[PDB]
Amino acid sequence: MLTVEVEVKITADDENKAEEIVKRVIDEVEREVQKQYPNATITRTLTRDDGTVELRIKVKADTEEKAKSIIKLIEERIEEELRKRDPNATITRTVRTEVGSSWSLEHHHHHH
DSSP, rough: OOEEEEEEEOOOOOHHHHHHHHHHHHHHHHHHTTTSTTTTTEEEEEEEEEEEEEEEEEEEEEEHHHHHHHHHHHHHHHEEEEEEETTTOEEEEEEOOOOOOOOOOOOOOOOO
């Protein structure tokens, strides 16, 4: 299993109330993901910058694909519940983990 780190930049009308909603929502979704994926660990850090609630989600899951599933359904919910009262509630996915560390497989064809 691997850990996936994304930065979801949540812009709302009230960054105070945006923080409040997104806090509860992830925690309510967390307990429902824990029963689907027992080994998957949901971690989140809301850090407010320039009026944006910068939600950095860390999902340690079986694969990256199954982690992105968890991330996406969180990004659904946190924008839905927030948009109901904050009209300009829009989340920005910025992935902070890159998976594609290439290497030179140099092999000199030297046999006798």
